């Protein structure tokens, strides 16, 4: 976020960009092709699908090739966990079963 | 067209598809949504759920989502209007409509391709035949047929009312799928109890639906249980109760329950100064100490409680309250969690219609929907506290109206108006809470007045809604006789008055008998209503 | 009734088979019947208000059948819910004559049957129309059915010294109606009574006595009764025993519920069905020479149902016959090789008598290996004999 | 290691279910399962069993060790012995939580089972506390903890290991 | 190597890497084979119909395998980022025959990480510092992994004459025997070859 980027030095941003590029290279080199995103699956998998609630007014978010969900606030969607994990991590969505 | 088999022609269709739920803001709608959510989550149906509080936001949500979804489900909305004209859909969408509102619009009934009604055919339905409604001496008979059409269709569209609970419909679907969990049966019970609490159905129909639900309760109570093998205290137990009509009486004092229940408050006239002595006479006739009666029910002495229901009935019979009992249900789980269906209804309803300004109405919908799951018992108990506050505010408002004589008999109908800035008007600004207030106030008025004429009239109530646009919410209520069939004409009377006066009437709520009206036009609107009802 | 528990219980099974379970309870809150299925794709679970006190039941792929006793106000009735029907009215009810009561009932493919206290059997179609009527040859005990087959057991007389006097009446109600067994007495272990009757899943009739022997109608051996197994060799204890749910020919399975200290399983908690394989009670069991022929005879004893289906006019899976014949031929080939290397030949000829023409022409190779020329000669002569037996 | 990861490993344990659906043998990477026949028992991993129970597709049976008399005997043996006794499962606490939270309807006497497993857990955690205190007091360099389970270790082990690292450095600071 | 046994060795590596204080020797065969299984099963399942139960069961099992692999690789990357000068020095000084502690991909990542960090430090402050102070050797700046950490273990193959060394004084050293299935709490440095050889499983 921009409010946090203003805390960083320019050289710190350069280091962070180099680290991001190197990490992306490493993840890309793991598999036969398309790599493995080891940023995903940060917690052990329980259910294949989860129910999520929109916290922010995001735009649209694709789930299949031709299909997308409108992430309007207070709407609830039942979607794959591996698709929703990053948005939940970033606070766009809320996992709503406990 | 009516769906004959929910399993074959609705569920097995939408099971393979992305689906969009439009859900109305009422407890029966919430319960049906919970049941349908549970089925979809069992089958991994990738649904999206949108709350809608009215027609315009339903149209907005449909405009937002119509590109991405081909199958839509409307819960407690859509059946009583021409959905094709309202939404202007593409030629190949499908609208499944599970809605209690009656009469079903004739276009919805006789549309055979796009609108699919999840409505039981054995409901109180009398649809006019297709040839009576749809297409020199020949053109003379054409005009005569058109006149007969206007007559018949007015006779059909006159009286609005409610049919079988959508939660019960979805539970019958769950039963046919044999994925009916005990919490789904509880949600069905809560939907029917929402209908009963809000007086949307007759007592005969409520007793019949309770008779239906009793058999499901027995089946669930013998799935893994009998008189000698019993389950953990963790498991949920639903029990049939011939319980008391008092509201929330297991969660606050019996005194507060008797004071804030609509029936006993109306009978004892507790708005009046003299009514408290009538209530004290009732309690002395029972033989309950006032300290125990004012103590919280869970802290009351247990020697007073194990025959309290029949004691209440026996004293009520000789006080003239001949029906203090009611056929209802309760749910137990764990050691201490116990709720009547009425308790869950009032808690969820208060979470929906909360007076809190923070967040929004959709956030309050979300709170109410969360509170129906047992992972959010804290939300349910918070809703119970809000329900106590709401009931107290209701009685204070009724007392203000009756003491100030705001209820004035406008010939064909009684009339009342809330005033801006007076206490709790912001709590009652929302149409559902306003409808409940008007019903409770009409019962209180009918018990208060001594005139035989006034005991038979309907009531129209107004309240402020907007100052940025200067409008009021107006509701119409039928008479409160025990002979009443719970049908009212105000949905059509309001629009006849509005078109006769060319008034700025806006029609956003799903019930036709609730409208928004410019504050200036209420005078001529009321004049037209007196002229119309005659 | 097969797969049902005694009537004095206030909460009991009315039937448990490979289709599902019917329970019924008469507790203070209500009297009712619960119907459930092993596979919930079949039909949804059902709850019936048992105000008319239905007490004998049966369950099938396409219908459920119920019946009760009479009282001085009202006569006995037969009630059915044909849940698989196309039409709007899934139920039907029938009323008996005065002072007459149903005694047992059963379902079959497209028909129902009720045996009556007046020594009378009535056949019904599953839409409710009455089919033929005939009298039993004595007081009935139980009934069973599968396809067009009807299986009835009855008292033919009075027992002595602990034994039971009863026999079977077996009918085939298909496109060429017949009586297969007319009044034949049924074998059972001495000083015991009949416990369970029913058809194995692929179609053969079987039953179990109250000692534990399960036996089957051997249609490969002139419709006699062949014991398969006991249950008390698998189980242990006097009062403990296994309570039977069903039989299957392929896979060879006996579904049974182990019961501890009781003649039947308790209604709650829900019992778990154990699976029992089969092992015929032959002599010299511990030897390979015993095990091979046990495998052979058990295989044919079960797989003759395919030939019964073909004889009745049904189509079946030919791969089952291929696998069964291959198993029999392969065990025979291996043991022929072993006995030949052990230098025995007449026993090899007796084993080879059960084989095909091609099989003996190939078994000459096993005879030739290790140079048992006389066994090769007798296998060639047997090949000539099989060419004649064609 | 998190308690959720300990639960993830507990989820690999095999339990018996009774399906209400028909499905042929399925050849999972971690070993084949099935066939699934309606009404008959079949043994499957706990994650799959819990998922099928949640989707209403089976009835779960208690393990052989979830019996009140057996658990009372094990609890009394644990309370009497000074060392950790052998446990009926290496993930008995996790098994108890998962099975009783998702299948108490199927498992009779679940309250008694939960209370007895809680008794065993309390006794064994007390024994582990005694072991840690004795280690630090007597300045041990090695301990034998044969019958402890992974969840029981993981509850206290991070704290204990950090403390012992500090203790080792404090008692070896004079080495040069 | 059976697929079930492959996933078992993956779990063993996962737990050992969790509890070991240092970066353990790489298991490239494990990582490559597990990824092959996952890609193959994705290929299998993309060619099957919707609403099928076995498809979902396979997807759940794949999620579990993917989680263990991702967590294992994340832990190794944490260790590499924590001890990047020391693992690089070890790889540079490694003789011929012992296995590497880094895969080629991990080694490329480690070299890039060290170059990036040194460049950042120089540019921000250490080109501005006086001339003889401009060089920090990160081999001395970064701490080494602490091999005297206490670890829990379960032992898989019997070991004898394992020497416990309580403190500085050699007189207090004493030997023990590790019976199969026993569990122990012990310093890592005394058991590190056993962890390498798989004779013990850290818990």
Curated annotation (Swiss-Prot), chain A:
Q: Where in the cell is it found?
A: Nucleus; Chromosome
Protein's organism: Homo sapiens (Human)
Q: What induces it?
A: Significantly up-regulated in aggressive melanomas.
Output the Gene Ontology cellular-component terms.
CMG complex; cytoplasm; GINS complex; nucleoplasm; nucleus
Q: Mainly resides where?
A: nucleus
Report the record's Gene Ontology biological process terms: DNA strand elongation involved in mitotic DNA replication; inner cell mass cell proliferation
Instruction: Please report the name of this protein according to its UniProt entry.
Output: DNA replication complex GINS protein PSF1
Family stated for the protein in its record: Belongs to the GINS1/PSF1 family.
Summarize the subunit comment: Component of the GINS complex which is a heterotetramer of GINS1, GINS2, GINS3 and GINS4. Forms a stable subcomplex with GINS4. GINS complex interacts with DNA primase in vitro. Component of the CMG helicase complex, a hexameric ring of related MCM2-7 subunits stabilized by CDC45 and the tetrameric GINS complex.
What's this protein's function? Answer: Required for correct functioning of the GINS complex, a complex that plays an essential role in the initiation of DNA replication, and progression of DNA replication forks. GINS complex is a core component of CDC45-MCM-GINS (CMG) helicase, the molecular machine that unwinds template DNA during replication, and around which the replisome is built.
Nucleus in keyword set: yes
Alphabetic keyword roster: Chromosome, Disease variant, DNA replication, Nucleus
- Asked whether the UniProt record includes Nucleus among its keywords, one would answer yes
Swiss-Prot record, chain B:
- This protein's record includes keyword Plastid: no
Task: Look up the domain of life of the source.
Answer: Eukaryota
Effect noted on mutating residue 76 to H = In MGORS7; decreased protein level
Subcellular compartments:
Nucleus; Chromosome
Q: What is its main location?
A: nucleus
Keyword Cell cycle applies: yes
Which residues are recorded as modified (Phosphotyrosine)?
130
Subunit details: Component of the CMG helicase complex, a hexameric ring of related MCM2-7 subunits stabilized by CDC45 and the tetrameric GINS complex. Associated with ORC2. Interacts with HELB.
Disease annotated for this entry: Meier-Gorlin syndrome 7: A form of Meier-Gorlin syndrome, a syndrome characterized by bilateral microtia, aplasia/hypoplasia of the patellae, and severe intrauterine and postnatal growth retardation with short stature and poor weight gain. Additional clinical findings include anomalies of cranial sutures, microcephaly, apparently low-set and simple ears, microstomia, full lips, highly arched or cleft palate, micrognathia, genitourinary tract anomalies, and various skeletal anomalies.
The entry assigns this protein to a family as follows: Belongs to the CDC45 family.
Q: What is this protein's function?
A: Required for initiation of chromosomal DNA replication. Core component of CDC45-MCM-GINS (CMG) helicase, the molecular machine that unwinds template DNA during replication, and around which the replisome is built.
Q: What name does this protein carry?
A: Cell division control protein 45 homolog
Query: What species was this sequence derived from?
Result: Homo sapiens (Human)
* Gene symbol of the encoding locus: CDC45
Curated annotation (Swiss-Prot), chain D:
* PANTHER family on file: DNA REPLICATION COMPLEX GINS PROTEIN PSF2 (PTHR12772:SF0)
Some GO term, biological process aspect, for this entry: which one?
double-strand break repair via break-induced replication
Q: What is this protein called?
A: DNA replication complex GINS protein PSF2
Q: Which UniProt keywords apply?
A: Acetylation, Chromosome, DNA replication, Isopeptide bond, Nucleus, Phosphoprotein, Ubl conjugation
Function (record text): Required for correct functioning of the GINS complex, a complex that plays an essential role in the initiation of DNA replication, and progression of DNA replication forks. GINS complex is a core component of CDC45-MCM-GINS (CMG) helicase, the molecular machine that unwinds template DNA during replication, and around which the replisome is built.
Cross-link entry Glycyl lysine isopeptide (Lys-Gly) (interchain with G-Cter in SUMO2), positions: 109
The N-acetylmethionine modification is found at 1
One GO CC term, this protein: nucleoplasm
Organism of provenance? Homo sapiens
Swiss-Prot record, chain E:
Looking at the keywords, is Acetylation present? Answer: yes
Q: Where is this region: Important for GINS complex assembly?
A: 146-203
Q: Which UniProt keywords apply?
A: Acetylation, Chromosome, Cytoplasm, DNA replication, Nucleus, Phosphoprotein
Q: Which Pfam families match?
A: Sld5, SLD5_C
Q: Tell me what induces its expression.
A: Significantly up-regulated in aggressive melanomas.
Cellular compartment(s):
Nucleus; Chromosome; Cytoplasm
Provide the leader sequence positions.
none
Please give the biological process terms from Gene Ontology that the record holds: DNA-templated DNA replication; double-strand break repair via break-induced replication; inner cell mass cell proliferation
| Predominant location | nucleus
Q: Does the keyword Cell membrane apply?
A: no
Pull one GO CC term from this UniProt entry. Answer: GINS complex
Report the function annotation for this chain: Required for correct functioning of the GINS complex, a complex that plays an essential role in the initiation of DNA replication, and progression of DNA replication forks. GINS complex is a core component of CDC45-MCM-GINS (CMG) helicase, the molecular machine that unwinds template DNA during replication, and around which the replisome is built.
Q: Which family does it belong to?
A: Belongs to the GINS4/SLD5 family.
Assembly and interaction partners: Component of the GINS complex which is a heterotetramer of GINS1, GINS2, GINS3 and GINS4. Forms a stable subcomplex with GINS1. GINS complex interacts with DNA primase in vitro. Component of the CMG helicase complex, a hexameric ring of related MCM2-7 subunits stabilized by CDC45 and the tetrameric GINS complex.
Q: What is this protein called?
A: DNA replication complex GINS protein SLD5
Q: Which gene encodes it?
A: GINS4
